[PDB]
Write a protein that binds this ligand. Sequence first.
Ligand SMILES: O=C(O)C(=O)Nc1sc2c(c1C(=O)O)CCNC2
Ligand SMILES: [Cl-]
Ligand SMILES: [Cl-]
Ligand SMILES: [Cl-]
Ligand SMILES: [Cl-]
Length: 279
Amino acid sequence: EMEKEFEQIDKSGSWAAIYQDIRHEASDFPCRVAKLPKNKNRNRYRDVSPFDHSRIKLHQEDNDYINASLIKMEEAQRSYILTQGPLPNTCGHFWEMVWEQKSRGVVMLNRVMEKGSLKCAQYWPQKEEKEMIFEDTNLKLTLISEDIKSYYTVRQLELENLTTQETREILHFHYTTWPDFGVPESPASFLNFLFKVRESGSLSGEHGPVVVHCSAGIGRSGTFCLADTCLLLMDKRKDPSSVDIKKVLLEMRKFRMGLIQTADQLRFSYLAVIEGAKF
Ligand SMILES: O=C(O)C(=O)Nc1sc2c(c1C(=O)O)CCNC2
Ligand SMILES: [Cl-]
Ligand SMILES: [Cl-]
Ligand SMILES: [Cl-]
Ligand SMILES: [Cl-]
């Protein structure tokens, strides 16, 4: 059914039109805090900001601001934190957010450098013996091991709250092969990656929401959460073809602006959901 709706859109070549309808219908809510002068250097892209109502608030006695949004999908009973790739001055805030929100997993969908340009700070240690200390938020981050596969890498990170000496294991799920232009021709690798994140337990309700990011935290990040939520809805509903991907994306856009950044990303999400539903 959705597979037939996909074919109809492909035949009529109307992906651009449907995507623009989503942009026109998208929620608009204030982003006052993100736009305060003191937060100028906490935002990677001036045109991508968290809404006030859903932004993640830092708990320590400093500026509470981070460019991060809580997406809470009520029917699917799943939550995500979507955030930008951290800046050199916000890596401490990023790990403070992971700690305070009790996240177990971080999903990274970009490379630190892409097409020769820097899209994200090097916010985790590449070498076991060169741990990272975030003196502003009093956290220590250590690479314990990594499992490098051909299209993604899973890292075992140890995050220590230097104030309490408590430690936690954070799983770093890094999709390293998103193409330089456009979307993956096939959703096979992306779905395998999603299933690996699921199997880890990082998306379960037992701990805090997974933290998902790309460079701006809206395009690739939006594809990941949209596909995941739509697949959940298809398992839950009596008539799984009743899942309206466009409605689900508009619901998610109540929580963060600009989720899905191109018509190709929209088509890719449809294709991922169609293929993943088959399993
Ligand atoms: O990596 C991503 O998918 C992502 O959300 N990218 C985005 S969204 C977005 C930009 C970018 C960028 O990477 O330059 C530039 C400014 N406008 C919005
Ligand atoms: Cl200010
Ligand atoms: Cl990288
Ligand atoms: Cl950077
Ligand atoms: Cl948009």
